[PDB]
Each structure stands twice: as C-alpha cells, then as structure tokens.
Target: Peroxiredoxin
Amino acid sequence: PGSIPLIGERFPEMEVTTDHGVIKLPDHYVSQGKWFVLFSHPADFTPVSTTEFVSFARRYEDFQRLGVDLIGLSVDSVFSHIKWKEWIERHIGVRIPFPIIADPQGTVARRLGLLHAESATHTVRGVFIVDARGVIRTMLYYPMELGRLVDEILRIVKALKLGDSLKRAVPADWPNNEIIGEGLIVPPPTTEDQARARMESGQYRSLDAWFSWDTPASRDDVEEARRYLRRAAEKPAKLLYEEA
Amino acid sequence: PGSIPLIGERFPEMEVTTDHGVIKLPDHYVSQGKWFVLFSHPADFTPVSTTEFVSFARRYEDFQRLGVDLIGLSVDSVFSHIKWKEWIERHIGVRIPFPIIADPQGTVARRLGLLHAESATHTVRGVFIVDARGVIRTMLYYPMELGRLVDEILRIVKALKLGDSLKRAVPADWPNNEIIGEGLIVPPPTTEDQARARMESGQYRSLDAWFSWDTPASRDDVEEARRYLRRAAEKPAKLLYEEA
Model:
C-alpha cells in the first residue's frame, strides 16, 4: 500500500517547477476561478505518454471552454519536457500548450501517491480533477501499459460542474443513462421547507421517494457532453501518423 | 490523506460476506482464471448507485464474455442488499446477477481506502480492476455525486487483456487513437535476440526508435471495444423509467 490525497480534501498545497516556471497548487488555479486536471506519466519520450499528451492537446480548447486548465507531471527535468514538446511539434505537428511539472526528486510524486508497485522510480498515469475551490473531486489511476480515455476526463468535469451549478447528482453513463437519459437526480431534502416546495408539487419524475429527477441541463450542456463521447467512439477519419 | 492498495500489488487477501455467501478475494477469481472488477457505492436505496447497478447488469454479458466477474461493495447488510436487488427487479425489471459485499464494520472499506473526506461512514465510488493472477491493474475513485461510465471499465479490461495477450502497450483513446488508430505499441526489447529479430527486419510503423506500433488485434477485438464506446455515446432509444 501507499498514501494518497482523498476526494473532498483540498489538493495538497505545493509550489512545483514546470516548463512554464514555478506554479503554486492549488492557488494558481483557485485565484482565477479555474478547475484543473493534474495528470502524471512515467517518462518523456515514451510512446503511450506521447499519445496522451497529443490527446489532451487536441482537447485543449474543450477544457479551456469549461474553465479547466491542464498540468502534466513526470520525474523528468524541465529540459526533458521542453525537448519532448519540440519532438511532438516536429514529428506530430501538435503544440503542447499546457505546463508539465518536473519532479526529478520524486517529491510531488510521493505526495500525490503516484509511485505504485509497477515502478519505484516513475509515476503511474494518475489523474486529479480539482475544482475552483481547490478540492479533489475525482482520482483515476491508470497503469504504465494503458493510455487514458481523455473524453471521460472531459465528461467528469462537465458533469461535476453541472451537478454543482444545478444542485443535482449525475446518474451512471450520463448523458445517456439507460433509466433517465439526460436526467439529473434531485438530492435528498436538506431542510423541511425545501422538502414541501418539492413534495407538495409535481415538477419531478419519481421511481420512489428516494429516486426523483428532472432535466434541468441546457440542450447546449447535454450536447457538449454527448460530443465528448461521440468523438471517443468515432473511428478517426485521418491518422496524424500519415502526415509527418 | 489515506492509504490504498497500489497498481501492481496482489489484491489484499480477505474473506468477505456477500449476498451470495462468503468469498475469498482474490483466490475465488484467480482459481477460475477470471479477472474481477470490485466496485463500491455509498449506500443501498440511493439513486446514482441504483443507476450504476443497472448499468453493470445490462453489461453483465459483455463482462462474462471477457472472462471478467463483478462484485459490489457497500457498508450495508446482506439483508439490505437483497431488498435493494428486489426493489430493482420490481421497479426497473432488471435482475442484478452478481454479488454485493456487505461491509457493516467498514473493514473492507478501510483496507481498500474507500472512506474519503466526503464521508467517514460510506464508501466513495471506487473501482478495482484485478487480473487472473490477482494483481491490481487499474483503480478509479469517483465521488458520491457522479455516476461512473461503465463502458470505460469494459474498455480498460478489454485493452489490458489484449495488451497482455499480444505483449503490447495501448495508446490513449484506443481503439480510436488520433495518431495510430487501433494500433498497439511495441514495448522496448526484452532479450538481445528481440532487439536483433525486429530491428530493421520487423513489420512495424515507427515515428522514432522509441515509438513503434503494429495492428495485431483482430477486427473482432477492435469492434468489441468500439461497440462499448458506441453504446456510451448513443442517446437511448427507450428509457427504462417508462416501463417495469
């Protein structure tokens, strides 16, 4: 076993060295009202890592539209990061616009619990989704041998910002839930006056007293989430390999 | 912070009480040559949890065809588990065929690190993906307010089984990687007769010495993983709320 930050905790406070300079987490993002996704990869100039950075870069504007920043992490130097970014631009034709943390002592890695039994020296493929208050909302741990599904990271952030904004819980497989579709779930009643306004009216669909929902997300919001999943499901038209 | 099992560790040995009887983990699955996905939910008779059990049950045959079993987990009693399964069968017309662990003392929850800052008493939405050797391969921590995307759990298990069988690493967003499509990544050479036998005489595409791939998976394997993602992206034809 190892120790990790937990969902509901403030992301651990730290200044990190990146190829963009020194950044304080989570404050750099909190002070702009931004969410961030921090993700790790084992090493620069590795093929799975390179596919992931290109996947994040292609989705960069999707993240920026949600008000989400990206930051990467490995135990490599900032020099390594800059040369890898130049490799990706020269060979794939894609610019990596977001910072990468350089963690050559493993300090950030040990703090975030990103050293698993697959490697004592390089991080697994961790993801921390952190809201605009600096609180950890979701964590994914993918292994050395498997690339992430980046569209699922976009679905998580979008669904969580809708849940927070509309005061709703999000069903499995939203926005394509097999029971309620794009429906969002009404939380249990907090106070008794905000139990009567709901209980003593309709306006909610219900399977039982503990299971009610409505569809309060904008068509734009629902369609943006559905687009993430359609992109994840689409056979790519042209491969970025075929044009060096 | 809190402690968790790590990727590459043997799943912690434990006997658990389920609504199907007592099971030893991971030995119950390992002894059959099966993978298992252990996932947790905060409490029976909660609506997000209910949508996720229905999602897993609808995908149960997809898991069984991969040689993957499912097992759930909450702090509720086996009685609660049985009454909740009856509620789902009566109100949604879906049978939940897989066991749920009853953890009323929080023993399993504490050993798997499933008690986060969102609740001292109820697990978050944890997922442990465990191979047929009993080794942890991936871990997801989703929060109380957000349902999982179960088709990404299928993609992970399908991609890891293919990676293990074909001796390949899996790119981001496989099988729809924007650089190599359904390509799988050749790992760095094992022997010195490998770095010889495939150096120039290999049948690989390469972007660089450290980035080579081929497409050794069957169209059946690729299309199985693409169907997961098509299902995730499809607006349901019929919702299960307008029937029983």
